[PDB]
Amino acid sequence: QQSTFLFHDYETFGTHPALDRPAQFAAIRTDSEFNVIGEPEVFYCKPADDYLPQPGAVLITGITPQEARAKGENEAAFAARIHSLFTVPKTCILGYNNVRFDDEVTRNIFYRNFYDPYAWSWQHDNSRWDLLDVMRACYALRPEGINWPENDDGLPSFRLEHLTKANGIEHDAMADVYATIAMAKLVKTRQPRLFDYLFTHRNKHKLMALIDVPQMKPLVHVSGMFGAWRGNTSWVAPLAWHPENRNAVIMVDLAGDISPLLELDSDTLRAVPVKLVHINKCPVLAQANTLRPEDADRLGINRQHCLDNLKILRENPQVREKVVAIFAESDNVDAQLYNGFFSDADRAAMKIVLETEPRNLPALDITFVDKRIEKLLFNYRARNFPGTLDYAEQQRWLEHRRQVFTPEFLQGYADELQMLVQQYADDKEKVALLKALWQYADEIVE
């Protein structure tokens, strides 16, 4: 294989990557230089009948539940197609905001449909990357040559549509994917060394090399959690590694007020200028001098304050033990991805479910230990393969739907639609989508 990039993007029916359902996936493969080498891959996911989309999401995407249902395949087949693209060897799977959103959608789709939620991103020399934190890093650290738009609040905006507009990039189903490729080419051209640096440091071992806990060696870190008001940037120092999470290091934000850290106990601590950096999540980290004096000035970052805090922290190493202590501590199976890793035996069993013909599942005679699996398998069969359900199973599914579609939920859904149709009365496209959402809800739930 040669190294490739797979740019992708989901449209979904709501904001929650587990509890809302996907609507559409789009992707295209490029070579290592961002030349398109594949065909556009665009397809839909039929939503199961235990779900109503968030009206807000449909207003954004323009994709109705009727359209995804008519054009889509079941989530099992949707998952299969995405897994086949993602597991091509030597693929860097990337998008725009995928680390915090799309990748969580992928993990949950794989989880619900009996794929490994994690292996795709690293096996066969694969990786992931995310152009959102690349753009944020450019603004903070190397803003030359790119136009940086402000939003209506007066803050720098990193919405993809704003950055393409501001930089002369033309921006159907493939719009977002092609815009993301355009942004990658933009940074590679205008900030070549930073682009190379950020690409190389997507690798967790390269990130590890930057981390010197004994010395509390300061680093620049660009993170959306720091806020657009300071260009999402600060100087941080590593205090300790997370006592449970092998991939998380506990950083102190040196720009913060460290008083609570010094003069408060770990229980009270559990603002507090502590954050986890997850080395498997493409965090932006670099040597402290990567943030140049002019840019620190521009972003309002106070170097002396950071250095004074760093000095205090180094002179008080008992703070390390303190922060380690901080981190030393629903019944919906769809929400339970992070309730733990499955055992080896359970993954083996789940693989048999995956590789068994849907018509043969009712007679499958395997054993699971993890308590999530019985429910995962029932939902998987009832959502994807409802013609294979026996009478008792149909009754179970009917009860499931009744438990989702509570009186409070249905009333609130009707209320939201009626509110939105008044609010958007002058937008004829939106009014039409809302009427479609009402009609779908009438069919599914009333």
Q: Are 146 and 186 in contact (CB under 8 A)?
A: yes
Cβ-Cβ contacts under 8 Å for 219 (sequence gap 6 or more): 210, 211, 235, 236, 237, 238, 285, 286, 287, 288
29-51 in b/e form (b: 16+ CB < 10 A) is: bbeeeeeeeeeebbbbbbbbbbb
Q: Shortest gap between Cβ of 222 and Mg ion (angstroms)? A: 20
Beta-sheet strands, E only, within 279-322: 284-287
Annotated binding site for Mg(2+): 9, 11, 176
CB of 96 to Mg ion, least distance (A): 6
Nearer to Mg ion, 22 or 55 (CB): 22
- Please, what is the minimum distance in Å from the beta carbon of residue 405 to Mg ion? 29
Nearer to Mg ion by Cβ, of 102 and 295: the residue is 102
Q: Specify the residue, 68 or 248, whose C-beta has the smaller distance to Mg ion.
A: 68
Judged by CB under 5 A, the stretch of 7-15, 294-302, 349-357, 414-422 that binds Mg ion is 7-15
- Burial letters 361-400, b for 16+ CB under 10 A, else e: eeeeeeebebebbeebbbbbbbbbeeeebeeeeeeebeeb
**Residue (40 or 358) nearer to Mg ion, CB:** 40
Query: Quick check: 103 binds Mg ion (CB under 5 A)?
Result: no
Give the binding range for Mg ion (CB under 5 A) out of 3-11, 120-128, 132-140, 261-269: 3-11
Q: Is 130 in the site for Mg ion (CB under 5 A)?
A: no
Q: How far is the CB of 169 from Mg ion (least distance, A)?
A: 16
Residue written as token pair 């840019």:
295
The whole-angstrom separation of Cα 306 and Cα 193 is 27
Q: Which of 7, 8, 9, 201 binds Mg ion (CB under 5 A)?
A: 9
With binding defined as CB under 5 A, does residue 253 bind Mg ion? Answer: no
Strands 248-253 and 233-241 come out as: antiparallel
How many chain residues bind Mg ion (CB under 5 A)? 1
- Residue 30 C-beta: closest distance to Mg ion, Å: 18
Contact 5, 17 (CB under 8 A): no
- Cross-strand pairs, 9: 26
The residue number whose beta carbon is nearest to Mg ion equals 9
7 vs 114, which CB is nearer to Mg ion? 7
Nearest distance in Å: CB 150, Mg ion: 22
Site for Mg ion, rule CB under 5 A:
9
